[PDB]
Amino acid sequence: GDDRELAILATAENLLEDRPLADISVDDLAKGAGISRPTFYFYFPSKEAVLLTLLDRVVNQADMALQTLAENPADTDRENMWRTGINVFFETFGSHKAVTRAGQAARATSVEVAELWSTFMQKWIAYTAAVIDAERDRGAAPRTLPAHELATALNLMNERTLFASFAGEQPSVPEARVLDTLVHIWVTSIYGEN
Amino acid sequence: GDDRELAILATAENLLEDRPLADISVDDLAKGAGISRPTFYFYFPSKEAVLLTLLDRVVNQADMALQTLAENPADTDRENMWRTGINVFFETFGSHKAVTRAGQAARATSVEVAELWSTFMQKWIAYTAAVIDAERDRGAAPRTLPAHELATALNLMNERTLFASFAGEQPSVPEARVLDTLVHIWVTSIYGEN
Question: Which residue numbers delimit the DNA-binding region (chains A, B)?
Fold first, then answer.
């Protein structure tokens, strides 16, 4: 009986838009799904383990998303081949701000999360560097910096930047700009010369 | 004061080298520093307090340093002018990696610390904007992205990255490159066209 789990997962993410994981208790979730306080414990050991699943879900959506682009190509220049990738992350995480803010300010307390993140950040960081080269052996991008390093600076910038945008921090870049703001910085560097 | 307010500090900083604040005692600080428990408290109320100062001392160091380039302009090529500026941080914080690591795992629970970094980061992001602006008035820089917003992204990148390097995370850019890297991206996007 799958259903039940989604109920719990979904319920959390839609309570997280109002308060953190602390202000929420294993019961407030029992209702949302439609099970007795105890039933819960058969799908999740604790609320902690729920956020982790949320997070992982959200993170995989991104990989599965960007993955789809590693398949069918898009008939459009080089500025979009990049933009459209970053937008996955903007668009995606930008949709589950709550879970992002939640996963983040919880990285400092869950190796599971820290890893889950510290992992993909490497697949994504790799995928990128890959293209950086696949755009150098075709002679389109100058051989300036070592792809991986270059790719890392960019990639990490995203994380911090796209975050302070969703967390409403200050310093930050108004959400409706953070994109163009990023894409430009990617391209100008991925390709720029001197 | 100072003599004894300095002992503590230094005596703290050198202790953060081997372990985290959470493992350092008021005792371990009174000793190594050379003073008495009570004498400490006359200067500091808690250890987090000593941390907040060490941090305030580092941060401010870098600001004056940077501040000290406005009066000593000199002759040079567009690029280098940035490396020496971005260098001020990688050099400063990268010579106090322990504090940095500490003041970091503190922004999550210290509003004094939160406001501290945030209050500066703005002054640094601003300073960037000021330049990237007048850099356009003189004709060198192309008028693309809204300075402050470009300045921000870049600054947001140097935060999350230099740290990710000092704290030797996974993934990160080896402490031994980052300067060459960050410097690149800043320029190529500041003066870059599209």
Answer: 25-44
- For chain A, positions 86-105, list CB contacts with chain B under 8 A: 105
Cα end-to-end distance, chain A, whole Å: 59
Experimental method: X-ray
Domain range enclosing A120? 47-194
Nearest CB to B188: which of A105, A121, A189? A189
Cβ contacts (< 8 Å) between A77 and chain B: which residues? none
A172 and A106 part of one domain: yes
Same domain, A52 and A1: no
Which candidate from A122, A156, A177 shows the least CB-CB separation from B157? A156
Verify that B26 and B51 share a domain, yes or no.
no
Using CB atoms, pick whichever of A79, A157, A189 lies closest to residue B156: A157
Number of domain units in chain B: 2
Resolution of this model in Å is: 3.3
The reply to whether A106 touches chain B by the CB within 8 Å rule is no
